[PDB]
Amino acid sequence: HWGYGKHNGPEHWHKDFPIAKGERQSPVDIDTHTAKYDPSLKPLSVSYDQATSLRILNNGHSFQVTFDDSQDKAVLKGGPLDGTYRLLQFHFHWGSLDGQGSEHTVDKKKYAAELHLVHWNTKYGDVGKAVQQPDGLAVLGIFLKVGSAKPGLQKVVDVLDSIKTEGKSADFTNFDPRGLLPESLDYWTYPGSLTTPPLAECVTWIVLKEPISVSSEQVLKFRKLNFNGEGEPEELMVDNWRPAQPLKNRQIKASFK
Numbered sequence: 502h503w504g505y506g507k508h509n510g511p512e513h514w515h516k517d518f519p520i521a522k523g524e525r526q527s528p529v530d531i532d533t534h535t536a537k538y539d540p541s542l543k544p545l546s547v548s549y550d551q552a553t554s555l556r557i558l559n560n561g562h563s564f565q566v567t568f569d570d571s572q573d574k575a576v577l578k579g580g581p582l583d584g585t586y587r588l589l590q591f592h593f594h595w596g597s598l599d600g601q602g603s604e605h606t607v608d609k610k611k612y613a614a615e616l617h618l619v620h621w622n623t624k625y626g627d628v629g630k631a632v633q634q635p636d637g638l639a640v641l642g643i644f645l646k647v648g649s650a651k652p653g654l655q656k657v658v659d660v661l662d663s664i665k666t667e668g669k670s671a672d673f674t675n676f677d678p679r680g681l682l683p684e685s686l687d688y689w690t691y692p693g694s695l696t697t698p699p700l701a702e703c704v705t706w707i708v709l710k711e712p713i714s715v716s717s718e719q720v721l722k723f724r725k726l727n728f729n730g731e732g733e734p735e736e737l738m739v740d741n742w743r744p745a746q747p748l749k750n751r752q753i754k755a756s757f758k
């Protein structure tokens with residue numbers, strides 16, 4: 502089964518998910534000098550006031566916080582998007598050290614981690630149907646650098662000891678994802694894919710320019726998670742990021758000058 506190890510990592514994924522060598526794979530390097538400012542791009546609309554978080558889960562490749570997506574409660578609209586996208590879950594990708602961990606890079610710069618808020622287009626009714634559509638998902642990507650703590654992240658970090666190993670989950674209600682957002686909603690956008698299997702080419706990527714700062718203590722708690730299930734040889738959940746993929750016939754657009 503797929504993972505991030507020597508023998509099952511991103512370089513192996515194409516064997517089970519041949520779309521890994523496709524025409525709109527993610528992540529990519531964002532060359533800031535080649536991204537073109539698009540004045541037609543609308544401001545992003547992030548409406549998270551009524552978000553209902555449900556559970557936090559270790560799925561063996563990341564940890565994710567899941568939300569109630571049975572109603573327009575936490576929605577993403579505007580920006581490059583047509584229509585309304587419901588927040589399904591967020592999760593992170595991080596490194597073994599602070600110089601790696603993000604999936605997207607900015608002028609080849611890797612960040613310590615990358616937060617992905619995954620949303621699906623309500624015109625497709627459910628996420629499984631949306632993953633089959635070229636405009637089915639919108640993932641909001643936010644870079645994490647190490648410095649000052651992010652207070653809005655602390656409730657996440659403090660529960661990770663209860664989901665150390667693959668398959669553990671816990672109630673995680675009343676978490677407000679607005680506490681994970683940077684000040685600016687300036688973004689880059691491009692058509693891409695899921696960055697984990699099945700690597701489906703269904704994502705409008707919206708990557709924020711402004712990183713959030715998290716503390717070394719906060720990221721160290723990410724790195725104490727395990728890829729393995731309980732009772733298995735302990736393999737620390739670190740470096741769960743896919744490297745940048747060929748841009749091919751794609752243009753990255755910037756919402757800002």
Ligand SMILES: CCCC(=O)Nc1nnc(S(N)(=O)=O)s1
Nearest residue numbers: 617619628632640694695696697
């Ligand atoms: C689509 C069903 C649930 C889901 O969210 N699957 C994802 N697979 N990769 C994602 S990423 N790293 O691009 O945000 S999300």
Ligand SMILES: CCCC(=O)Nc1nnc(S(N)(=O)=O)s1
Nearest residue numbers: 518519520632633634699701702
């Ligand atoms: C537009 C949604 C679907 C998509 O974009 N891509 C894929 N269709 N089959 C794939 S496999 N077996 O490689 O994972 S991927």
Ligand SMILES: [Zn+2]
Nearest residue numbers: 593594617696
């Ligand atoms: Zn992700």
